[PDB]
Symmetry: D6
Subunit: 170 residues, 12 copies
């Protein structure tokens, strides 16, 4: 709803990030290993403070509760593309925030950074995630065979995308 | 009214700057992307401490509430010019402070720093500010086409300026 | 099963780690010289923060009491093997938690890290431990002669291993 | 024919790399901007020397003429995948070396480095290369729309891949 | 003509740059001071090796003679704009290379970096330079009063621009 | 015997070392990924200059032609063990020099460095090498299962060792 | 006389210094641009800690209230000259303390630092100050034309000096 | 006029500079202690490469023979003033080149750097030089008493200046 | 009695070390100059943290009172020897702890660290300590003449030592 | 008396040192300038932590009151000489501590550092200081003409010395 | 003879040092391992340039031939003692240089550094080395049991010493 | 005679300095230990380049042969004093250059550097130099007992000095 906002990741938010990053159910959706020392996380945060190739956001509601995370990575400024990734804390999954956040990230991407294309990756074995994204405007541009090793097996992922033209003329 | 005071920005004012630097509406007037972790801001602040090409001032009232920011950037040592930009916190806007601060900035630029020229950029779609600036003696020297991408599209901005000779000598 | 969790080692867990490292009987299991300084431990921790060739984990119960430690070292990314080490604090041994921790270290190695082989070393003079590793599917691949100097004399150790294919099938 | 040899790139090969990195035609196949001072190249080379996420190989003939470059990047330690990219110097192109080198890269990736998957990107408007790659066992897993801005417009690329199990076991 | 090319500035070209930078007739066109130690020039070259906000080019003919310089500065990757500046060595002024180079720089800008806008600055007192640029597609978007101090006086400069759409649909 | 000498590795010997490291058949003996950059090799050399946990030696003949290489790594100063590796350039194999180099590496380990145990790894698929090590007094202490990924598949290696007491008596 | 003392500037006195530096009327006396950041002031303080070419002193009364500041800069050790600057906080002007501070700065320059010449600059538009310096023995040696840009226009300043021989006799 | 040019000082011109700095009679004009090390000169050159508060120029003739040196120091960007210094090597004095170099330094200060005031110091005991500066439009603004210790005694110097407005009209 | 415990020295024990390092009487037994600012001690401590040629242990009782220090230095990786030195805080001296700690140090040196030889130096004018050490199995291997300048004059010291084989096997 | 001791200077003692160093009556006896920022003093203390060429001591009584300072500087280890300097805080001047401290410093010098010679400097205009030192064993080895500028004038100082042999055979 | 001299070790002499250090017959006399990369040797030389605790000398004859090495280590400046070690290149062993060099090192030690005691270590199994040193004034102060592991065995060494008083009153 | 010239020491003069710094006889006149690797000398040279407390001069003849060295050290900014020391290479000694150079050093110290006092130390057992210095106007202000250990024993040195007022004004 109206009460959801995206603001930049700050040092004070790292305990919430850490807590998610050490949760394997949550990190499987980012095809990332669920082990990260707090120090690894903080030192990488420090290292990338001035990195222009990424934007990391925390999501809050009106009381300032941390709902989840939005990220734009691999921002390329010739091709004007970037990869979008999102995580909703367990407690907040299934409340309808998903679409709002995807929209907010697309708005950031398209009305602020002036990117041309946003793409994401989703487990083919999560076909309800796939559909969601389709309803939010994304379209399948690839079916990556055995791209990621997750939970003892290689899994297929859809690569999906959306263009600036489509998002702004809606 | 007259109770406003200028002083240089310092580390302890940065939570206030940060707050404005993450406000979409406020930053659109500066054509700046509204995202800055506190760490990026502080690190850049630290790096520019001895940088002569800029001056960053904070505006406080008698009881020390932080009202706004006045800055001069791209200060050039030869051409004696600089770009002026101003921000008034939203809770303190529409209180007639603009003029007062624009004049403090002009007075500083021309009676202390000895610059010859000050210019600014203002969105064309912001005619109230254009007007305000004109009344404060600035004059349009350019209409930059599709200069900045703001809130989903390319926009035009006025470049306006004022000379030290004009400002100092007007009433003479 | 459920209550015991595994998370990455943190700077705040270092006094727990140091305390085990001063028990010489506990360090004899890792063939590591006991009695190391807290500062050495901390500075070595700082240095390996981004070292991808190791994973150090702590074992916490439901109330967040530190039970012990599980580590994977010498992780090799071509051969996809690593050495496994485990320590259960003395006040939590005999509670039957070794098995669950071993299974947890194997789950991590094989379902997340995607390694092919996990091996470990055990003193031959610790046949109870050897036996526990045998039940968890480890097989002896070496009987290393006078490999380590422990408590005044050279001792033999067993090298034992398990493959990913065996753990996942 | 069979007289080609692979070895790791080293500092003394950089004038050759530089030459290719400033060639517009050659770099368009890598979707890379064709501008790199020697200094940027050397500095980045130096920085990545111990970087495990990449392997850069040079191809030499019996008399040591530098023919091309074979690289693997984004090597991931868990997923065991990497992106393959190749370049053959223009004076040595159209001499049937492609296949030979693509096979050396596959043989390295799968019989030495123990990767599970290799992928590449090829412009859709480059059907000869797509075909060549297919014949070398790669298979289309995606048609990326308007992925790269090349020579004035946004273009589609095929993402193609090959698995270690398929490659190792085909003839069995 | 066909024989003119743009390649990246290299360390070996710095003696040619220096020689131009210490020539006041040449630097007045860039509103820059004609004093630069070779060491200042080289140390600034070293410092900006990895700067993404600029591209500096040397211009040569077929025998590899240094004809002049092309530069794109203040590249901004949200607004996708940049400032273009050019210098033709004295010996090569008046041979018709000017238009080719402006075209080459626009081609780099528009077919490679994917920028939206290119702008430049010209002395109002050089109205034949102004016209040239007008014929090459640039249009006046400003008349900057007393913007630069040059040869003992403050001088007016036109700010001129061209958009990607116009350059590519020609 | 006499003609072959052993001296420490030097920066000027690095092109010889690099050249062996590009022969994949030669590097398969060290289970080391071949094709490494000269700069990586040099910078790793620079970094380990004062590392007391390794000794890298070159083997020179009477005319100062580089024959091969002998190294001692993972030298442990409590357990007093180390791993031995040896490479004889291809143009000097079949000349019967392996034996002399092994004996020379053992002499160094046991009469100068005062180590207690020397071990090595050998591919099981290289029974000639195993046999040579057996004649020089090494005994198998482990048959490591699928330890290394070589030429497209996991292979077994032998771990073999000799003690100081046996070499000196 | 007695109550007023002079001691070296300290990091804890910096907020006092900063506060004077924001009064533009106070900084006009030093021809220094007012409104400088506390961090710039502190970092410049840190940088000059061991700079032998300056001495910055604070003036304290009997109750340790900061009265003002006295500085000696561009101290030259061959020519043995230095430039003198003094600032008396506004809440302590008109108390007749300038004289005592000048005499104190001269005593320091000539009886401790062993300098030969002390000079200063004063705005011509500040004839009261010029007059005070004249009574303390300073003589005009220069009338510098349009030397500084102050409050919107170029102004003339006096350069004035006193020698060691004159102060000590 | 034409033949004499001015360009920025370069590292390759340093032996020329050093050579003047060892003539004590030449350095007396700059009130600079002569006999400074080449290494000090070079390292100070390295340190000031990006210092915007100075410009050091060399004077070359048609055949690229170094004639002398012209410098602008203490350039202040608010007050827009700077101090001018000039040295003509002894083998090129009496050739009437001082005038052209002064005019060239003023042209640079006022038509490029956009300064408002240029000043210099001259020993009173050098009335020929004072006179030359007077012809080039400089006016005495100060007679500094015993400002410098030169050749065994304190000497007076003249401070002289010219404004931009006067030079440009 | 048996309630003593050894652990490695750590930063927080340094005020105690400092106290002993500035005690003239205590330091004369170590032939060391009794002057060390806390800063010199901490800086050197920090520098030797990863230094393998030494081990520094603190001795604590059941309630954690710091009793003394046991150290081994000049640990040589080849010769497998080290110099042993011990200090018992004065308030805890003459309580029969010496033997107990000397034995803990021997047990560590020979059953954990696998050294072959431990030696120490003792002032000749300190016959009680010589004797104590002899009873603990050390044997005189040298009488160093005028080796150290102590309390105004040059003095002789006994160098005494013990072998691992002797220590481990005595009772066999 | 018995209750006076010498211990090494520590960081915590620097406020007492500073207070003396900014007292001109006290620093004149060391021919030193009475101006030292606390930061200068502390940074020089940090720099010389490992300097073997000096030993700086604080003097206390039984309640741990800071009485003054002892210093051995320019320790040379071939020539085995050093310069001794002492300061007694104003409050403690004239109580008879002087001789005890000189003795303690000589004892340190001669029974611990094993030096051969200790020398000092005293204002000729303080002839009662000269005599004291003579009674403590020092002897004049020089009368340095106008060696130091102090209080507006050049002053003569005696250089006095004592040898280890004499101190230990007493 | 007269033609033997001691001068400080220099970088240019390191190839001669290296050559000796990688000769096990030569390094056994210093109880040192015969393996040293040239780089290890040079980097340690660089590190110890300013170390006051040692003096390393090269020995030459009149034509400037490198004869061997003299070293004074563990120089302690309170106790005024140091360890002396010497090596004569193989080619020059048995020519009578030994005594001259020991004398030269003692002269350096006693007439220049002003040390009180010099000690050395010798293999008990080299009793002709022991006697030599006895004739040069050294005397046994210890018989160190199994002090060093050399050539596959632990060996006993004599510790021998000489005092300044004895060397200078000869 | 008069053909001598002073200039500051520079890096390229260091082989000459090194040669003198390793000469026992030459260094005994400076009470300095005659051992200095080239590296120690260069490193210290480099470190003192901007050190104001010293001046090191080389003496050259018309054809640029390096004759000797004149130095001033411990230059104090307040007391305006310095220690003078001189060395003449042995091949050029006993040629009457001493006086000439001592006078150049005095002329520099007093007419350029504006010092008030110069002093030196000379071995008592070196009466020829004492005398020479006296004739050059220096006067004994101290007889330091057993100040330096030289060639096996402790020796006395004269401290001699000269004032700027005396030197400048003598002939007046």
């Amino acid at each position: 709803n109206s009460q959801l906002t995206l603001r930049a990741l700050e040092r004070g938010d790292l305990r919430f990030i850490h807590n998610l990053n050490n949760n394997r159910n949550i990190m499987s959706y980012w095809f990332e290993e669920p082990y990260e020392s707090f120090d690894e996380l903080e030192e990488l945060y420090n290292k990338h403070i001035h990195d222009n190739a990424e934007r990391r956001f925390v999501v809050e509601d009106a009381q300032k509760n941390l709902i989840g995370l939005v990220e734009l990575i691999e921002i390329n400024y010739i091709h004007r593309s970037a990869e979008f990734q999102i995580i909703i804390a367990p407690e907040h999954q299934g409340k309808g925030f998903a679409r709002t956040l995807i929209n907010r990230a697309l708005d950031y991407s398209f009305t602020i950074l002036n990117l041309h294309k946003i793409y994401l990756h989703v487990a083919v074995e999560n076909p309800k995630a796939v559909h969601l994204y389709e309803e939010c405007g994304f379209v399948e541009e690839g079916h990556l065979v055995e791209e990621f090793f997750i939970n003892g097996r290689y899994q297929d992922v859809k690569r999906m995308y959306i263009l600036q033209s489509k998002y702004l003329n809606r």
